[PDB]
Amino acid sequence: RDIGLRIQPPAEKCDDPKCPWHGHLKIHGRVFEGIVVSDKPRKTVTVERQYYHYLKKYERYELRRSRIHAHNPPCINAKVGDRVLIAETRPLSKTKHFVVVAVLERA
Amino acid sequence: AIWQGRSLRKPSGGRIVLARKKRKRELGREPSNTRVAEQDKRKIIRTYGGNKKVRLTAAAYANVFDKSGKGRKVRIIRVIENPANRQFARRNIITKGAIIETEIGKAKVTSRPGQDGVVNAILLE
Amino acid sequence: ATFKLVISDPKTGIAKQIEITGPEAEKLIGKRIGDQIPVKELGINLNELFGKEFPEDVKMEIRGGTDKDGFPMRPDIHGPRRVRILLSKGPGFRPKEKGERRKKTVRGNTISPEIVQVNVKLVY
RNA sequence: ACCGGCGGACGGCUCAGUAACACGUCGGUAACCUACCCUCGGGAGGGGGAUAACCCCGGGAAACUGGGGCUAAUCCCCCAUAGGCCUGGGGUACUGGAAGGUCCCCAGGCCGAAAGGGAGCCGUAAGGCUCCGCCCGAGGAUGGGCCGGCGGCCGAUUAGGUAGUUGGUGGGGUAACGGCCCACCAAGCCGAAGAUCGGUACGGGCCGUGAGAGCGGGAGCCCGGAGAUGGACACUGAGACACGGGUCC
Ligand SMILES: [Mg+2]
Ligand SMILES: [Mg+2]
Ligand SMILES: [Mg+2]
Ligand SMILES: [Zn+2]
């Protein structure tokens, strides 16, 4: 099966209705890539991305980081320290609006 | 009364000072606690955009479906259990997901009576 | 108490007004809206009022009234007191606008000395 | 003049509040509503009812307001049919990056339309012929609701903050997704890369100044937000919790 990203699906199936690979969830919008930094809550991870911001007056750069909370389906089940790919969806809780769709490099 | 606009708390824990009045299009309504009764009773609600909702307040019949695709209209005896609230079963409150007992067996409700106005259930084995 | 009576003959479309006081009016104090009472018992030269032959033992029933300050009587409020409530239609309010509601001062059903006008109709 | 229809939610005014998804920008809604307007496909069958205006009598200092008589509609209410919504079982016709969507066939229910009305000619009459109109479905358009990433103030003589608080499962409610709100199960969430608290302030396109790099401002014109003596809350409507509409303190 393909859901529009053109990447390989997870090996095993699941029963989560909020799983894009095996359930009713639909993805549309941005796609980001990042590193997991927290996995304490059930089915929730925190993903960090780093980028550079240009300071025009001082003609130099500074490093900034963006942290996003993502839904973690049981068929993928990412852990702290690995690279993941996330996609935008409809609101799922107060702070969750993304879902993990692939683990690119296990820790 | 019932305002479904936004929370007054930031995810960090700090407070938010409201910057406007409550708009009319953000209000909710009293829950309908659909009970088991001898005679059925429903009302009509005029909703945003001038649409309608049928609200069921007392239920006496139900539609039960088997795995073969046939259905029967039978009457409801009682609510065996309701995982949504701890004290719904004692008060005989029907919501989606409740287990009801009928004259042909136990059934699990699949519709939302407060939003649709009928009680549909699938037969248990 | 002194009462100003408005008697309407429903079969003709004509009404007459007279003033009644004393033991005659003291009889009427206590009657609600929608109850009958004979006119002969009260005492009124009815055939002279309208100039027409009228049936024997004919009676009348109270339809409404207005108190001494200008507020009317509302059939659905029990007792003789005066209240101030929110209305959307009916006696004591004329809307003029769609869905409008307003707070008005009204009376009850039972007659009392504070009343001045009494509207009744003839019942055969 | 009255009943009835459409409009009065735009336009105009001010900058108190607000350090926030308020605003700028790029995206999303497969999670949503929309009277007026455009195109295509259909429908207009049968009954009932009151009441203002008008006549009789009025009440109150006025603001306002009572009873009886009679009458009409593109006013109101029923019955039918079309139609809509929910759930279970099958089929694979459509769009799309991808179907909790659309389409076809069974089955159990709930809701449930309409004004062939008005004007003008040919009509001997029969009846046409235009003009303006009523209801349902599919789509658009117009006007919005909601969501996300990024961007732009000062203070450490403010260092720890949060307990529906962060997430999960089952529901309710909403036009719609969501701790938006409940019942149960866990211990999460934010922070010296400055949380929390305090100060000051409507945001932007822009404007003043300077060789430039910069520094300072953001009343007047346009686009967005908010308010109608202060604080709370409802009715009607496609749209309001309504500046020249309603209720309480
Ligand atoms: Mg200010
Ligand atoms: Mg019908
Ligand atoms: Mg500023
Ligand atoms: Zn899965």
XYZ file of C-alpha atoms (C1' of nucleotides) and ligand atoms in Angstrom:
609
model
C 0.000 0.000 0.000
C 1.006 3.620 -0.597
C -0.346 6.738 1.113
C 1.414 9.275 -1.102
C 4.865 9.582 0.476
C 6.519 6.925 -1.725
C 8.288 5.128 1.143
C 8.189 1.598 2.495
C 5.385 0.673 4.923
C 5.960 -0.924 8.332
C 6.454 -4.664 8.532
C 3.504 -5.684 10.718
C -0.098 -4.544 11.009
C -1.948 -2.894 13.886
C -5.437 -2.104 15.158
C -5.123 1.604 15.868
C -7.836 3.605 14.068
C -5.421 6.562 14.148
C -2.742 4.783 12.158
C -2.334 6.092 8.601
C -0.969 2.754 7.361
C -3.723 0.528 8.769
C -6.533 2.829 9.911
C -8.754 5.745 8.914
C -6.309 8.607 9.500
C -5.469 10.834 6.528
C -2.305 12.896 6.081
C -2.042 16.184 4.189
C 0.263 19.209 4.457
C 3.853 19.428 5.664
C 6.342 16.585 6.110
C 9.235 17.049 8.539
C 12.225 15.006 9.695
C 13.693 14.897 13.169
C 15.118 13.157 16.224
C 13.099 11.716 19.110
C 13.868 13.264 22.504
C 11.061 11.907 24.698
C 8.733 8.908 24.665
C 7.289 8.778 28.197
C 3.531 9.189 27.496
C 1.512 6.419 25.895
C 1.701 6.629 22.092
C 3.289 10.097 22.134
C 6.789 11.269 21.241
C 8.613 14.594 21.149
C 10.591 15.360 17.989
C 13.261 18.048 17.683
C 14.547 19.753 14.533
C 17.477 22.153 14.323
C 17.977 25.021 11.901
C 19.869 28.278 11.459
C 18.529 31.828 11.666
C 20.283 34.739 9.969
C 20.846 37.902 12.029
C 20.953 40.692 9.477
C 22.563 43.446 11.556
C 25.411 41.240 12.793
C 25.706 39.263 9.516
C 26.043 35.981 11.433
C 23.932 32.915 12.205
C 22.372 31.473 15.325
C 21.061 27.973 15.982
C 17.412 27.385 16.874
C 15.414 24.259 17.653
C 11.767 23.360 17.035
C 9.946 20.754 19.136
C 6.777 18.971 17.987
C 4.568 16.362 19.677
C 3.599 13.434 17.463
C 1.316 10.408 17.674
C 3.196 7.103 17.801
C 1.342 4.096 16.338
C 2.060 0.650 17.808
C 3.173 -0.793 14.463
C 6.180 1.567 14.378
C 6.857 2.291 18.053
C 9.780 4.695 17.932
C 12.180 5.079 20.855
C 14.412 7.830 22.187
C 17.320 8.612 19.903
C 16.318 7.637 16.371
C 15.557 9.595 13.211
C 11.886 9.707 12.226
C 9.649 11.221 9.562
C 6.410 12.971 10.580
C 3.382 14.278 8.663
C 0.622 16.794 9.382
C -2.970 15.759 10.173
C -6.149 16.958 11.854
C -6.011 17.810 15.578
C -5.694 14.742 17.797
C -5.347 16.318 21.236
C -4.461 19.657 22.775
C -0.879 19.537 21.508
C -0.741 16.681 18.966
C -1.155 17.468 15.266
C 1.443 15.189 13.622
C 1.890 11.431 13.263
C 5.038 9.333 12.856
C 5.047 7.615 9.460
C 8.528 6.051 9.283
C 11.699 5.371 11.241
C 14.631 6.160 8.976
C 17.513 5.108 11.236
C 17.031 3.148 14.444
C 19.157 4.377 17.344
C -23.384 28.681 29.988
C -21.561 25.863 28.184
C -18.632 27.367 26.291
C -16.551 25.154 24.007
C -14.179 27.846 22.800
C -10.716 27.293 24.225
C -8.850 26.425 27.375
C -7.565 29.198 29.621
C -4.272 27.388 30.231
C -1.097 27.233 28.209
C 0.625 23.847 27.819
C 3.426 25.185 30.025
C 0.950 25.878 32.831
C 0.627 29.651 32.654
C -2.705 31.443 32.554
C -4.429 33.224 29.677
C -6.402 36.458 30.009
C -9.446 36.438 27.748
C -9.306 39.098 25.041
C -12.939 39.161 23.862
C -16.453 38.081 24.742
C -17.851 34.630 24.020
C -19.196 34.339 20.489
C -22.584 32.728 19.972
C -21.298 30.091 17.529
C -19.132 28.524 20.271
C -21.819 27.315 22.685
C -22.852 23.792 23.607
C -26.054 22.338 24.987
C -27.266 20.179 27.844
C -26.547 16.465 27.384
C -29.544 14.262 26.736
C -29.358 11.307 29.118
C -31.403 8.864 27.064
C -33.290 6.599 29.473
C -35.258 3.383 29.103
C -38.999 3.954 29.326
C -42.377 2.588 28.296
C -42.951 5.167 25.546
C -40.489 6.976 23.309
C -40.050 10.742 23.290
C -37.952 12.961 21.023
C -37.611 16.654 20.210
C -36.206 18.801 17.405
C -33.386 21.348 17.692
C -32.805 24.193 15.233
C -29.054 24.431 14.682
C -26.420 26.662 13.082
C -27.218 27.487 9.493
C -30.862 26.687 10.168
C -30.468 22.907 10.188
C -32.074 20.340 12.480
C -31.132 17.659 14.993
C -33.461 14.987 16.380
C -32.807 14.412 20.087
C -34.028 11.204 21.720
C -34.852 11.517 25.418
C -36.676 8.244 26.166
C -36.186 4.957 24.328
C -38.434 1.899 24.288
C -37.517 0.073 21.061
C -34.297 -0.808 19.277
C -33.093 -2.178 15.955
C -30.903 -5.286 16.197
C -28.769 -6.601 13.340
C -27.221 -10.034 12.875
C -24.092 -10.850 10.893
C -26.247 -11.983 7.960
C -27.647 -8.494 7.352
C -31.238 -8.832 8.604
C -32.773 -6.631 11.287
C -35.591 -6.786 13.826
C -37.384 -4.085 15.807
C -37.677 -5.274 19.418
C -38.126 -3.653 22.810
C -35.501 -2.831 25.435
C -35.464 -4.277 28.946
C -32.483 -2.752 30.741
C -28.870 -1.600 30.516
C -26.427 -4.270 31.654
C -23.333 -2.048 31.673
C -21.959 1.168 30.207
C -18.179 1.725 30.033
C -18.554 5.480 29.509
C -19.603 6.311 33.064
C -19.472 4.372 36.306
C -23.104 5.049 37.270
C -24.879 4.983 33.903
C -25.933 1.350 34.288
C -27.854 1.908 37.519
C -29.773 4.885 36.131
C -30.459 3.124 32.798
C -28.673 5.635 30.571
C -28.104 4.606 26.946
C -25.119 5.870 24.971
C -23.077 4.520 22.096
C -21.128 1.482 23.239
C -23.525 0.487 26.017
C -24.655 -3.120 26.426
C -28.427 -3.495 26.501
C -30.564 -6.564 27.074
C -33.541 -7.331 24.848
C -36.033 -10.133 24.356
C -33.712 -11.858 21.853
C -30.356 -11.417 23.607
C -27.727 -8.868 24.520
C -26.718 -6.163 22.069
C -24.141 -3.401 21.728
C -25.287 0.050 20.627
C -23.645 1.474 17.504
C -25.481 4.792 17.017
C -25.518 8.090 18.904
C -29.079 8.572 20.199
C -28.616 12.220 21.158
C -27.470 13.082 17.625
C -29.586 10.710 15.517
C -32.792 9.922 17.389
C -32.752 6.125 17.021
C -31.143 3.248 18.913
C -29.303 0.774 16.680
C -27.461 -2.200 18.134
C -25.574 -5.237 16.857
C -26.266 -8.636 18.379
C -23.675 -10.204 20.679
C -22.594 -13.838 20.638
C -65.784 48.864 45.648
C -67.045 50.683 42.550
C -66.923 48.769 39.268
C -67.351 50.044 35.718
C -69.004 47.247 33.750
C -68.694 46.683 30.005
C -71.376 44.252 28.850
C -71.010 42.887 25.326
C -73.844 41.182 23.465
C -71.953 38.693 21.265
C -74.894 38.079 18.928
C -75.139 41.721 17.877
C -71.714 43.375 18.099
C -72.872 46.140 20.459
C -71.639 46.861 23.979
C -72.956 48.978 26.838
C -71.221 50.505 29.850
C -72.745 51.122 33.283
C -71.414 51.840 36.760
C -72.237 49.565 39.700
C -71.367 49.972 43.378
C -72.416 48.775 46.796
C -73.852 45.407 47.805
C -74.352 44.684 44.105
C -70.641 45.066 43.379
C -69.667 43.455 46.683
C -71.255 40.274 45.339
C -68.834 40.075 42.409
C -65.585 40.275 44.416
C -63.889 36.886 44.255
C -64.798 35.567 40.812
C -62.101 34.380 38.431
C -61.883 34.551 34.646
C -64.192 32.214 32.771
C -66.990 31.699 35.310
C -70.630 32.607 34.843
C -73.029 34.557 37.047
C -76.698 35.427 36.408
C -77.468 39.045 35.620
C -80.870 38.931 37.325
C -79.223 37.952 40.610
C -76.855 40.908 40.322
C -79.661 43.234 39.258
C -79.580 45.089 35.934
C -82.465 46.445 33.835
C -81.056 44.539 30.886
C -84.054 44.967 28.583
C -83.792 48.727 29.073
C -80.040 48.828 28.424
C -80.204 47.422 24.893
C -83.863 48.046 24.080
C -84.483 44.430 23.093
C -86.460 41.536 24.511
C -84.046 39.180 26.215
C -84.382 35.549 27.309
C -85.231 34.757 30.896
C -82.613 33.676 33.464
C -79.822 34.721 31.077
C -76.368 34.871 32.652
C -73.002 36.498 32.010
C -69.378 35.465 32.394
C -66.353 37.600 33.190
C -63.828 37.971 30.375
C -61.300 40.494 31.650
C -60.534 43.783 33.311
C -58.090 46.581 34.047
C -56.860 47.785 37.414
C -56.975 51.325 38.754
C -53.461 52.198 37.560
C -53.991 51.010 33.985
C -52.631 47.488 34.087
C -54.751 44.635 32.683
C -55.595 41.201 34.057
C -53.888 38.091 32.700
C -55.890 34.845 32.896
C -52.923 32.555 33.511
C -51.539 34.136 36.715
C -53.248 32.878 39.859
C -54.308 35.124 42.705
C -55.242 38.799 42.989
C -51.744 40.290 43.262
C -49.833 42.487 40.814
C -46.645 41.161 39.215
C -44.027 42.254 36.685
C -42.936 39.503 34.295
C -41.380 38.895 30.881
C -43.778 38.330 27.977
C -43.581 37.352 24.324
C -47.263 37.651 23.331
C -50.777 37.555 24.727
C -52.818 40.022 26.760
C -50.803 42.905 28.134
C -48.275 43.157 25.294
C -48.311 44.044 21.595
C -45.040 42.855 19.995
C -44.556 44.877 16.742
C -41.272 43.035 16.033
C -40.254 39.470 15.288
C -39.299 37.480 18.360
C -39.426 40.481 20.687
C -39.934 40.046 24.435
C -40.548 42.707 27.054
C -41.119 43.019 30.793
C -44.610 44.258 31.665
C -46.649 44.844 34.816
C -49.857 42.784 34.964
C -52.575 41.575 37.349
C -54.054 38.186 38.222
C -57.366 36.426 37.611
C -59.319 37.138 40.782
C -61.245 40.390 41.133
C -60.407 42.792 43.961
C -61.255 46.369 45.001
C -58.180 47.653 43.136
C -59.952 46.842 39.856
C -61.875 49.557 38.003
C -62.958 48.050 34.662
C -64.700 44.701 34.200
C -65.348 43.250 30.728
C -68.108 40.619 30.503
C -70.158 39.039 27.731
C -73.742 37.810 27.614
C -74.189 34.026 27.592
C -77.492 32.479 26.561
C -52.788 53.559 7.007
C -52.717 48.280 8.271
C -51.495 42.839 7.329
C -47.445 40.476 4.296
C -42.142 40.307 1.787
C -37.011 41.823 1.661
C -33.315 44.987 4.415
C -31.841 46.916 9.132
C -25.342 41.647 11.071
C -23.091 46.276 5.711
C -21.824 51.284 5.859
C -20.012 55.216 10.000
C -17.097 55.901 14.915
C -13.081 55.132 18.655
C -8.321 52.445 20.322
C -10.156 50.898 26.473
C -8.778 45.740 26.697
C -5.188 42.187 24.703
C 2.219 39.809 24.875
C -2.393 36.098 22.357
C -2.453 31.570 16.654
C -4.154 38.948 17.908
C -1.259 40.087 13.398
C 2.251 39.053 8.635
C 3.488 34.904 5.461
C 3.327 29.844 3.395
C 0.139 25.656 3.669
C -4.395 22.477 5.334
C -9.891 21.117 6.132
C -10.539 13.588 3.306
C -12.945 17.655 10.277
C -17.249 22.417 8.497
C -21.712 26.216 7.678
C -23.510 29.800 3.820
C -30.056 33.896 2.472
C -28.997 36.888 -2.173
C -26.445 34.809 -7.549
C -25.066 30.964 -11.952
C -25.678 25.978 -14.639
C -27.918 21.292 -15.255
C -31.847 17.453 -13.473
C -36.827 17.137 -11.344
C -41.813 18.828 -8.812
C -46.186 22.179 -7.801
C -51.724 16.900 -5.856
C -55.994 17.304 -1.490
C -57.997 19.800 2.883
C -58.409 23.246 7.263
C -57.639 27.905 10.333
C -57.322 32.320 12.708
C -56.392 37.494 12.887
C -54.737 43.306 12.076
C -57.200 46.989 9.244
C -62.684 48.275 9.953
C -67.623 48.622 13.801
C -69.310 49.022 19.642
C -67.554 50.153 24.639
C -63.178 51.490 27.062
C -58.985 51.833 31.290
C -54.676 54.986 32.891
C -51.434 61.451 34.729
C -48.756 59.411 31.156
C -45.679 55.252 29.132
C -48.788 51.843 27.514
C -53.077 48.643 27.266
C -58.621 45.377 27.875
C -63.383 42.841 26.037
C -67.012 41.765 22.145
C -68.324 41.681 16.339
C -66.621 40.625 11.185
C -62.613 39.628 6.946
C -58.064 38.366 3.098
C -53.614 36.784 1.267
C -47.244 34.817 -1.955
C -49.988 34.585 6.391
C -50.390 29.926 9.446
C -51.419 24.215 10.087
C -52.447 19.195 8.434
C -52.512 14.496 4.624
C -49.973 12.377 0.572
C -45.592 11.791 -2.654
C -40.627 13.327 -3.753
C -36.611 14.015 -0.424
C -33.045 13.878 3.999
C -30.366 11.305 8.269
C -28.585 6.854 11.253
C -26.912 1.383 11.416
C -26.025 -3.659 9.502
C -24.790 -6.956 4.797
C -23.011 -7.110 -0.253
C -21.034 -4.989 -5.375
C -16.507 -2.192 -7.316
C -18.947 2.821 -11.440
C -15.926 8.231 -9.944
C -12.338 11.889 -8.321
C -7.677 12.034 -6.024
C -1.005 11.782 -3.936
C -4.108 8.833 -0.720
C -11.180 7.414 0.630
C -14.528 7.251 7.723
C -16.552 10.520 0.625
C -19.663 9.941 -4.143
C -22.463 5.739 -7.156
C -25.598 0.504 -7.386
C -28.577 -3.711 -4.640
C -31.006 -5.718 -0.189
C -32.753 -4.881 5.200
C -34.574 -2.027 10.317
C -36.021 2.759 11.612
C -36.651 8.332 12.359
C -37.590 13.138 10.203
C -40.403 15.162 6.239
C -41.518 20.142 0.629
C -44.020 23.516 -2.345
C -47.512 29.834 -3.934
C -49.333 27.583 -10.899
C -49.320 32.692 -7.037
C -49.393 37.849 -9.629
C -49.400 41.292 -14.382
C -50.368 42.139 -19.859
C -52.321 40.896 -25.044
C -54.827 37.501 -28.474
C -59.141 35.361 -26.657
C -67.066 35.584 -28.372
C -65.869 31.904 -25.378
C -62.891 27.812 -24.960
C -57.425 28.359 -23.978
C -52.742 30.110 -25.493
C -48.353 33.397 -25.634
C -44.816 36.235 -23.161
C -43.116 38.934 -18.032
C -42.030 38.228 -12.707
C -42.259 34.338 -9.310
C -42.738 28.956 -5.368
C -40.244 23.694 -3.571
C -36.327 19.442 -3.817
C -31.349 17.385 -5.481
C -25.811 17.786 -7.558
C -21.971 21.371 -8.239
C -19.926 26.359 -8.269
C -19.499 31.255 -6.594
C -19.591 34.806 -2.460
C -18.843 35.563 2.935
C -16.856 33.110 6.886
C -15.417 29.202 11.145
C -11.278 25.989 12.664
C -5.867 24.080 12.437
C -0.357 23.986 11.717
C 5.268 25.498 10.633
C 7.940 30.096 10.598
C 8.689 35.764 11.952
C 8.687 40.548 15.188
C 9.214 44.264 23.038
C 11.740 45.426 28.244
C 13.085 43.228 33.545
C 16.971 37.814 37.494
C 16.953 43.551 43.378
C 11.231 37.817 39.335
C 14.121 30.516 39.692
C 11.433 26.984 39.771
C 6.052 26.456 37.473
C 1.518 23.266 36.511
C -2.711 19.011 39.364
C -8.101 18.954 33.946
C -2.406 19.963 34.766
C 0.369 16.275 30.035
C -1.051 11.775 27.576
C -4.334 7.127 26.995
C -9.235 4.323 26.713
C -14.921 4.950 26.678
C -18.517 8.713 25.872
C -21.222 13.640 25.556
C -21.643 18.032 22.996
C -20.830 21.057 18.502
C -21.950 23.258 11.875
C -17.240 20.777 12.545
C -11.796 18.241 14.804
C -10.124 18.919 19.783
C -9.458 18.180 27.769
C -14.030 21.680 24.617
C -16.546 18.940 28.876
C -17.317 14.241 31.899
C -16.105 8.663 33.891
C -11.970 5.613 34.584
C -6.204 4.474 33.990
C -1.195 6.507 34.430
C 2.768 10.406 35.815
C 3.433 13.317 32.574
C 4.072 18.705 30.451
C 7.262 23.615 30.462
C 12.276 25.824 32.102
C 19.140 29.672 32.501
C 18.734 28.640 24.388
C 14.850 32.377 30.483
C 9.691 28.940 32.147
C 6.452 31.499 35.629
C 5.390 36.382 37.220
C 5.620 41.845 36.713
C 5.923 46.473 33.073
C 4.450 48.746 28.685
C 1.559 48.337 24.262
C -3.903 47.127 19.302
C -0.738 44.264 14.523
C 0.865 45.314 9.444
C 1.422 47.838 4.579
C 4.206 52.216 5.939
C 6.464 57.146 8.099
C 10.864 60.589 10.204
C 16.137 60.763 10.020
C 21.086 59.220 8.246
C 26.657 58.384 2.877
C 25.448 53.644 4.206
C 25.407 49.919 8.155
C 21.685 51.678 11.534
C 18.504 54.333 15.281
C 13.346 56.044 16.493
C 7.655 56.118 15.573
C 3.291 53.398 14.205
C -3.496 58.957 15.246
C -5.432 60.526 9.950
C -5.400 56.582 3.899
C -5.996 50.631 2.965
C -6.142 45.481 5.019
C -7.007 42.541 9.916
C -8.699 42.667 15.494
C -11.631 44.501 19.449
C -15.748 47.782 21.911
C -20.728 50.441 22.473
C -21.384 53.518 30.905
C -18.733 48.650 34.076
C -20.100 43.109 34.701
C -23.003 38.884 33.296
C -27.111 36.494 30.002
C -30.855 35.297 26.172
C -34.848 35.765 21.847
C -35.350 36.102 16.203
C -32.523 34.995 11.961
C -28.828 32.371 6.438
C -25.683 35.450 9.624
C -25.895 38.719 16.382
C -25.429 36.941 22.184
C -27.048 42.927 17.986
C -24.138 51.194 18.812
C -29.948 54.377 16.830
C -33.542 45.770 19.379
C -34.465 42.707 24.827
C -33.335 40.989 30.666
C -30.628 41.338 35.618
C -27.000 43.638 38.930
Mg -3.988 51.290 25.333
Mg -45.120 15.924 5.238
Mg 3.959 48.302 18.569
Zn -0.263 0.640 11.850
